[PDB]
């Protein structure tokens, strides 16, 4: 009972290291992006730009609304911050449980994620697993993309169900 680590190309031809088991796949970078608080972007500067837009909209919403480039930027920034906060929260959750950021723990998490994905159809693209640590257990939640060949690629991991 094992998973394999290989390199698979994305739509632009760029290779990504990927853990594979059965009919499921996890780009290994997902561990940093979603579970260990290293989501993309600089939180402090992102929040500063979002705040100035939010404050412009709060004080003058009609005028803010007139140029959709405002809504576009603000919403894009909001999703980046949202992805960072979910990822830092996940890192906090694993740390609280004593599941430190090591290769073996991250392999453990991925193996269990891959196991939970084996059934997944287009009828249900969401799974969850319990991982174990020195300071207790935690449930984590994954969402999956169903590919044209029916295999699954991990989209997201979060500490809470959505």
């Amino acid at each position: 009972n094992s998973f394999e680590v290989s390199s698979l190309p994305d739509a632009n031809g760029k290779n990504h290291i990927t853990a594979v088991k059965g009919d499921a796949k996890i780009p290994v970078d997902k561990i940093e992006l979603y579970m260990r608080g290293k989501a993309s972007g600089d939180l402090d500067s992102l929040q500063a730009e979002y705040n100035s837009l939010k404050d412009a909209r709060i004080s003058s919403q009609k005028e803010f609304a007139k140029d959709p480039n405002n809504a576009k930027r603000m919403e894009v920034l909001e999703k980046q911050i949202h992805n960072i906060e979910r990822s830092q929260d996940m890192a906090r959750v694993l740390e609280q449980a004593g599941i430190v950021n090591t290769a073996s723990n991250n392999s453990m998490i991925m193996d269990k994620l891959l196991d939970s994905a084996q059934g997944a159809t287009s009828a249900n693209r969401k799974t969850s697993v319990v991982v174990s640590g020195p300071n207790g257990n935690v449930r984590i939640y994954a969402t999956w993309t169903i590919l044209p060949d029916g295999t699954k690629r991990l989209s997201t991991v979060t500490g809470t169900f959505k």
Partner: protein, 158 residues
């Protein structure tokens, strides 16, 4: 950098398949938000059409993007559709949609001539907040803070 046609293709793919590109390793909801908001500033009609399709889809795993779609409509010439959608769906809008709705009206309080609010919508929104406020996912939308801003903006209404 995508044409409007390619952004539209990606959005129809997300609605039908759950991905914008089969071999994109990004979260497809992130890809879909890029496509939707890129479309909106280039092709308002098409951008707002796909906002509507996203709100009405029953086949989308993304929650954040339903907020986005609602939000772009609220801030567009088609705000009335978004008011109507909220009135008709308040009972079961998501966390993301509820927070956008509550935030929009908080902001609207500062407008010199805010749009007329449909009968009973604020009561519906508040009720839905009481149903969702204990959802452990709520904090990632700052629902509680947005609720306080809303209620503090409409205190006689509390």
């Amino acid at each position: 950098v995508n044409s409007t046609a390619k952004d539209i293709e990606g959005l129809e793919s997300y609605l039908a398949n759950g991905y914008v590109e089969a071999n994109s390793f990004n979260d497809p909801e992130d890809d879909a938000l890029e496509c939707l908001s890129n479309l909106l500033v280039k092709d308002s009609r098409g951008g707002l059409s796909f906002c509507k399709k996203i709100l009405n889809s029953n086949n989308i795993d993304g929650v954040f993007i339903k907020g986005s779609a609602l939000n772009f409509l609220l801030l567009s010439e088609q705000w009335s559709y978004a008011f109507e959608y909220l009135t008709s769906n308040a009972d079961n809008i998501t966390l993301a949609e509820l927070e956008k709705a509550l935030f929009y009206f908080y902001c609207a309080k500062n407008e010199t001539d805010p749009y007329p609010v449909p009968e009973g919508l604020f009561k519906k929104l508040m009720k839905r907040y009481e149903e969702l406020k204990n959802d452990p996912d709520a904090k990632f939308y700052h629902l509680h803070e947005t609720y306080d801003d809303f209620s503090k903006a409409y205190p006689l209404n509390n």
